[PDB]
Write a protein that binds this ligand. Structure first.
Ligand SMILES: C[C@@H]1O[C@@H](O[C@@H]2[C@@H](O[C@H]3O[C@H](CO)[C@H](O)[C@H](O)[C@H]3O)[C@@H](O)[C@@H](CO)O[C@@H]2O)[C@@H](O)[C@H](O)[C@@H]1O
Ligand SMILES: C[C@@H]1O[C@@H](O[C@@H]2[C@@H](O[C@H]3O[C@H](CO)[C@H](O)[C@H](O)[C@H]3O)[C@@H](O)[C@@H](CO)O[C@@H]2O)[C@@H](O)[C@H](O)[C@@H]1O
Lengths: 303, 303
């Protein structure tokens, strides 16, 4: 059977790995030959694999709990634990972090490049909301041990001149990166170890590259206290859920990829993409591609 | 022609009129017999009608510019203007506010409830982001003149004890309501005037009511002298883009509605909704419906 794709431009699609920032370009990079991401992972048969969702914006904000302490050496990095409502009992067969939570990489061992939970605040002590939400720096684990630097687990630290209220719950809305955060450091994601069924690290077919649905992330700095040196960057994804939603009506034939026509202006320039059942859409043999264009189905091809 | 609906629960659907907040329940209220909203308006034949979009999360954040002034009477209500990237020249045939911007109502001439735009910050004077993004209160116009107090246009006011940098861009991410803003005040939307084709007011047929895809909006206060009166509330939407996205491969037949089966638990309880072409979900003849269920197509009925 044939596949019908609605003519929705990528500019009208959600960036699953970074909501609140629309898709600006389709990005091709020759130095990116893998994808160890946990957000934006979709499959034809398995649905939303890994830790992704079909509602990226809804599952974007999290909560954590203070741990009444600080990391060894650095007094400002108060330790804290991510709260998981989806996995209340700590089952080793289920993901530790809440579904849809951010997975931007920060580096192996770098006390110069920290993330930015642009909005973190304590509860109101009344159960109605939160209070004094402002920009703060965060990262996964403690940046000391091998198993807690890139671990994508529930332990984090928050940079704050004062001390967090012990045992009190806080909100988390990850928006921004600070320090020496380049685009390549955000493209990598923290390693996940354990038993739970996480998404594998995919690689493109031999000789082909990947379209990334890039977006521009602005800065959110502070001009007081110790200060926040946030920087502007870019974020990439595997594919938006909007494109792959249509494919579930008639799944791909057994061991068959699809040929997609990306048409920009009338019939002047029409690029060819090859979409696989594992989630990624490959091109061939990079440069940015405008988002004002629609995807059209050509035929079914063999890998 | 039949309509196949994917079994996606409403808890996995985006709330158009309030992203960053998952759908909590399906809400049906007897006193709500209309919807003058400009967000969440979709049509089977006309596409995204009014001021809505298929990417509510991407187009949620806005930018405004200062006007070097304040409202008469209240010194703290600095005046600004919402800049539209989709309508650079102020053509009266296009919507004044940028597409996808918030439309939460507040009440005409109200100095007791100022839904807070929450996150607002000045530009960094570097061209790469914004700085000191903090929680501030906002509203449309100046709450004095009938033509621009509650009229959903470019003029807004921001409450800030210190003056705003004149002629500089500011970021805004509206999230929260302050003062005595109940659920009913947020339900209504500011009136629309002009020549642009805005979404009309929808009234359900006699003897039927609506399903509202409601969600819970927390509070984000401030501990300072002036402070913020942020309160918790709920937000409702007419329709989610995920449901109407499917109904485009085969559009509805000539002047016929659809009968949808909402199946809960293990099929013990099945409710029957009526979906119309205007984009509203009729639920016959209010209480609260859980989101743990999937939609199923039954037949085509005549309104
Ligand atoms: C070397 C550096 O000196 C001070 O740096 C602060 C900035 O602090 C932040 O950035 C630094 C350098 O990248 C580093 O990543 C640190 O973990 C982080 O806190 C920042 O507060 C700016 C404010 O504009 O001021 C200085 O550049 C010191 O605070 C850092 O701890 C670090 O030793
Ligand atoms: C000092 C006090 O200020 C006003 O009441 C404040 C609140 O101010 C805020 O709310 C009121 C309406 O409730 C109004 O909308 C004002 O523009 C807004 O900023 C607020 O400061 C709270 C907590 O911080 O305290 C008071 O309720 C004013 O209404 C009072 O008459 C009085 O002057």
């Amino acid at each position: 059977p044939i596949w019908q794709i609605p003519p929705t431009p990528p500019g009208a699609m959600v960036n699953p790995r970074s909501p609140l920032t629309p898709v600006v370009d389709l990005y091709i990079n020759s130095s990116w030959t893998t994808c160890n991401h946990q957000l934006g992972r979709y499959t034809i048969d398995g649905g939303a694999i890994g830790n992704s969702t079909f509602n990226p914006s809804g599952l974007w904000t999290g909560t954590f709990t203070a741990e009444s302490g600080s990391v060894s050496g650095q007094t400002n990095w108060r330790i804290a634990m991510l709260d998981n409502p989806y996995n209340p009992t700590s089952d080793p067969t289920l993901p530790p972090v809440p579904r849809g939570f951010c997975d931007w990489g920060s580096g192996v061992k770098s006390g110069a490049r920290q993330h930015l939970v642009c909005f973190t605040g304590v509860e109101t002590d009344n159960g109605e909301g939160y209070k004094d939400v402002d920009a703060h720096m965060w990262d996964y684990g403690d940046d000391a041990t091998i198993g807690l630097d890139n671990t994508y687990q529930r332990q984090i630290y928050i940079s704050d001149p004062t001390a967090l209220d012990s045992g009190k719950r806080y909100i988390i809305i990850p928006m921004g990166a600070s320090g020496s955060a380049t685009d390549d450091t955000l493209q990598i994601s923290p390693n996940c170890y354990g038993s739970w069924d996480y998404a594998p690290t995919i690689a493109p077919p031999l000789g082909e590259q990947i379209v990334w649905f890039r977006s521009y992330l602005p800065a959110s700095s502070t001009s007081a206290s110790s200060g926040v040196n946030s920087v502007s960057a870019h974020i990439s994804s595997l594919m938006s859920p909007d494109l792959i939603r249509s494919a579930y009506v008639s799944g791909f034939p057994e061991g068959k990829a699809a040929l997609l026509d990306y048409v920009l202006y009338g019939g002047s320039v029409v690029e060819q993409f090859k979409m696989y059942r594992e989630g990624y859409l490959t091109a061939n043999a990079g440069f940015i591609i405008p988002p004002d264009g629609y995807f059209r189905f050509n035929s079914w091809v063999s890998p």
